[PDB]
Design a protein around this nucleic acid. Structure first.
Ligand SMILES: [Mg+2]
Ligand SMILES: [Mg+2]
Ligand SMILES: [Mg+2]
Lengths: 65, 220, 81, 119, 195, 129
RNA sequence: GGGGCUCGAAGACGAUCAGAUACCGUCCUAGUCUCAACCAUAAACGAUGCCGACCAGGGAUCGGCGGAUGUUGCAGGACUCCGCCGGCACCUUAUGAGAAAUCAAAGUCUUUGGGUUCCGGGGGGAGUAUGGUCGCAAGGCUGAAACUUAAAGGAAUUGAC
């Protein structure tokens, strides 16, 4: 834990996750990021967000748009 | 429909139990398959193989189909059944019965941290069945099951989420492979970790603390 | 065993043999458990007992009788006899 | 040959087990009792059963056999509880002690027991 | 009763005699060996060993599931009683395999305790009790395996006096512990001795 | 010939432990054996043990408490730095939650967690868990 | 070089057999015995390298030693009982191992590490070709490749014979 080559990139990894909407504000530990899964990433795609924002009739209409 | 024939089943049928961990606690020899039906809520059943074995008689070859079945909800309970019968239907049914009869508990530990819902075997555990030796080693939270199809099915039914597996010997032999996997899953609850060695307290066995209703109230 | 909250996570806590301390597996069908009742000064069973558990290994060894005898001699000292 | 089928053996054993009170030694009496105490279709099977029952009465009139039960000596209970003498067979005086047992009674036991002997 | 009376009685019943040899067990029970090779097994330890056995067996208050077994045809009379003096059951002579493991057998009866005349004679019930978590008590002599029997009383199982007197003494102290025998004397004059 | 008394001691102790014995005898004794036993006892894996002076090499009588699963030496005594301990932990130990590796560092004989605490390395004597 | 009884590779004859350079009979040479030199191989086997520690029980036996014991047509010798060390083995049982047969070591192995030597990598070709080297020779030690092949093999099981 007291290793700087753990603290620095642990902070960086958590910062990237909290920046991309993957980890929640209640998951600020290096253990939660090990529990990530593919659908977490696929939920942040622009097509997925366009579909879920109500702008597209379907997730294929979102990709077409 | 069901008339219990043993003390444990006669004790279960009216509802003197909630789970089956107390039966494990006293290592009671479960011998009726409706006990696990009543106690364990969820049971799933997939047959693994239907191998035709043969015995050469003077006339011809008498063939019998032997079926392998794996039982257990993915929450720490798993069992294995093997049954050889004249035709596949009775083999499958009897193997299901035996698998349900052979349910054992598995111990799930953590890799390096105690964030809830344990997901891994606690220690390095091995199991040998003839020649097939299988080893499972703890894995981090996101690893998943690293094993062949057979140990993967057994561990999925056991409730394990991540593990690192190895193998040695003729793993093509399905019977020995799956028996070694299940056997070492039993051993997972056998290692003496430093946490377990708090001094033990003793509790009356079901045969001893239910003596009042077991002297001569035969079936009423 | 213990979660970060501080709760149980395993299904149950097993028994361990009172002679060799090795734990008793849920499929150990040679493992037994003996309740030795205690008496009063007159020699009347008072309804309380001391419980011992023996694993299948120590039984199959043949040292179950010696281990149980030694355990009883050691244990009766605290609670008189 | 002349050996008896398990059916006739079994039925003879049962009729003797439950109807030893009146049934007699003659074969014809045995069969005339069998015809109404049990339903046997074949007449010659009935004859075989009656003859077999007669043979076992010959067997039993000398002593008990391993087949039948009820009134469990042959007809009357209380055979061995009457073998209780007015004095116990176990004596207490000069009771069979040798040199090494004398050394034992010199050990934790009491060397002045009532039954100690110099033998 | 007082240990002196029981000790002198088993001295009368020749319960202290051993065999020409012993196994690597029971040296905790022997005293020494005679010049002829016989063993002189210390009755003193036997007394409180069967006393602790009595403590064990009056602890379950449901004597129905206590089978006393005797394969040898020499101690059948003793096992015949000790089953109505107490509430225990008793199977004499022949023990059909499967009565402790086969749940479809007509004679299926799983106990909480087994009492055996001799571990050498009826080893089959011992091996079968090993598959059901059945605690076992036997009257082991020298040259008797300790393989699965859990409480072993060091007595003789080849004598008319030894068996019978020993069984009666056990039953007497068991009834005493149960409280039925308030301080008194024997009302069960020796009947179990062989005819 | 007796080339490593530590292996004989550990093997005899482990063999006695598997058989359910309550005491074990170790002959001959030595200072490194005493230090290994002291570490094991401090972590709570054995109990009492007494050294008997026979004027030649000494014996040890050790009291077992049933808590020791396995204990064994590593031969030859490979040299490990502070950065390699993790690797050996992944090899000789059941899991990261418990278990111990014994190192003979220049600060003395200790376990691997203490070596990480003091940030020192050395050779590997054995392991126990 | 001596010796050379018996037995007996080679050889001859008789017999059996469709055939019998074999099995069965008889006569026999080198050999079998020994001395002085060569060879260096065997199912040279416990098919199990040597040294060390630990881990079940039992009885018998061989050598030495300690103790007790009470008999010899005679302290000691013979005999009986107990114990210690060393050896050849044997019996029972895994709680051990192993594919199993089986093994008290072939155990203390995925919970893998006491020291050290030799040595194996699917079956053939093949212990063959050639080179080197020892030998009078027969031969020994070292020892391939091209090519071919999907099995060869171990233990146990049920039938059939
Ligand atoms: Mg060779
Ligand atoms: Mg000698
Ligand atoms: Mg090859």
């Amino acid at each position: 834990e007291k290793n700087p080559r753990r603290i620095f990139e642990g902070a960086a990894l958590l910062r990237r996750m909290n920046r991309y909407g993957l980890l929640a504000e209640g998951q600020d530990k290096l253990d939660y990021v090990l529990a990530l899964t593919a659908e977490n990433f696929l939920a942040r795609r622009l097509q997925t967000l366009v579909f879920k924002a109500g702008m597209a009739k379907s997730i294929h209409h979102a990709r077409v748009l | 429909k069901w008339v219990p024939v043993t003390k444990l089943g006669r004790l279960v049928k009216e509802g003197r139990f909630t789970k089956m961990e107390e039966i494990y606690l006293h290592s009671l020899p479960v011998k009726e398959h409706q006990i696990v039906e009543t106690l364990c809520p969820g049971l799933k059943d997939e047959v693994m193989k239907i191998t035709p074995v043969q015995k050469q008689t003077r006339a011809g070859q008498r063939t019998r189909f032997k079926a392998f079945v794996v039982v257990g909800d993915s929450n720490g309970h798993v069992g294995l059944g093997v049954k050889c019968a004249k035709e596949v239907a009775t083999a499958i049914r009897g193997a299901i019965i035996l698998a349900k009869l052979s349910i054992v508990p598995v111990r799930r530990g953590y890799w390096g941290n105690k964030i809830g819902q344990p997901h891994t075997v606690p220690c390095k555990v091995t199991g040998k069945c003839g020649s097939v030796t299988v080893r499972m080693v703890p894995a981090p939270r996101g690893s998943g099951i690293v094993a062949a199809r057979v140990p993967k099915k057994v561990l999925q039914f056991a409730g394990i989420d991540d593990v690192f597996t190895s193998s040695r010997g003729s793993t093509k032999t399905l019977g020995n492979f799956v028996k070694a996997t299940f056997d070492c899953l039993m051993k997972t609850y056998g290692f003496l970790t430093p946490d377990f060695w708090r001094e033990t307290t003793f509790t009356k066995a079901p045969y001893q603390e239910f003596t009042d209703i077991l002297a001569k109230p035969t079936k009423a | 065993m213990q979660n970060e909250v501080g709760d149980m996570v395993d299904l149950y806590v097993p028994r361990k043999c009172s002679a060799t301390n090795r734990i008793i597996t849920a499929k150990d069908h040679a493992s037994v458990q003996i309740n030795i009742g205690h008496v009063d000064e007159n020699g009347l069973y008072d309804g309380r007992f001391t419980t011992f558990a023996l694993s299948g290994f120590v039984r199959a060894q043949g040292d179950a009788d010696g281990s149980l005898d030694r355990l009883w001699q050691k244990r009766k000292a605290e609670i008189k006899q | 040959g002349r050996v008896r089928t398990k059916t006739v053996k079994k039925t003879s054993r049962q009729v003797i087990e439950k109807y030893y009170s009146r049934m007699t030694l003659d074969f014809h009496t045995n069969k005339k009792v069998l015809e109404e105490v049990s339903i046997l279709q074949s007449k010659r099977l009935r004859n075989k059963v009656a003859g077999f029952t007669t043979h076992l009465m010959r067997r039993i009139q000398r002593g008990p056999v391993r087949g039948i039960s009820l009134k469990l000596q042959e007809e009357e209970r209380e055979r061995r509880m009457d073998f209780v003498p007015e004095k116990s067979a176990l004596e207490v005086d000069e009771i069979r002690v040798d040199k090494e047992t004398m050394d034992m009674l010199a050990f934790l036991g009491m060397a002045d027991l009532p039954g100690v002997e110099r033998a | 009763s007082q240990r002196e009376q029981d000790i002198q009685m088993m001295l009368a019943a020749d319960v202290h005699l051993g065999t020409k040899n012993c196994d690597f067990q029971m040296e905790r029970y022997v005293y020494k060996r005679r010049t002829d090779g016989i063993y002189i097994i210390n009755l003193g330890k036997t007394w409180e060993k069967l006393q602790m056995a009595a403590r064990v067996i009056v602890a379950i208050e449901n004597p129905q599931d206590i089978i006393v077994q005797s394969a040898r045809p020499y101690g059948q009379r003793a096992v015949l009683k000790f089953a109505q003096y107490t509430g225990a059951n008793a199977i004499a002579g022949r023990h059909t395999p499967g009565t402790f493991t086969n749940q479809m057998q007509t004679s299926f009866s799983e106990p909480r305790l087994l009492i055996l005349t001799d571990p050498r004679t009826d080893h089959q019930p011992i091996k079968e009790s090993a598959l059901g978590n059945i605690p076992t008590i036997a009257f082991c002599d020298t040259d008797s395996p300790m393989r699965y029997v859990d409480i072993g009383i060091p007595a003789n199982n080849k004598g008319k006096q030894s068996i019978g007197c020993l069984f009666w003494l056990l039953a007497r102290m068991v009834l005493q512990m149960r409280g039925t025998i308030l301080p008194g004397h024997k009302w069960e004059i020796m009947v179990d001795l062989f005819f | 010939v007796r080339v490593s008394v530590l292996n004989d001691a550990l093997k005899s102790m482990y063999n006695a432990e598997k058989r359910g014995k309550r005491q074990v005898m170790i002959r001959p004794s030595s200072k490194v054996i005493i230090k290994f036993l002291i570490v094991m006892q401090k972590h709570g894996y054995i109990g009492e043990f007494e050294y008997v002076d026979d004027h030649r090499s000494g014996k040890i009588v050790v009291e077992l408490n049933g808590r020791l699963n396995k204990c064994g030496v590593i031969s030859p005594r490979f040299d490990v730095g502070v950065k390699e301990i993790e690797g050996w932990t992944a090899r000789l130990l059941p899991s990261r939650q418990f278990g111990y590796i014994v190192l003979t560092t220049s600060a003395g004989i200790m376990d691997h967690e203490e070596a990480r605490r003091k940030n020192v390395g050395g050779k590997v004597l054995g392991f126990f868990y």
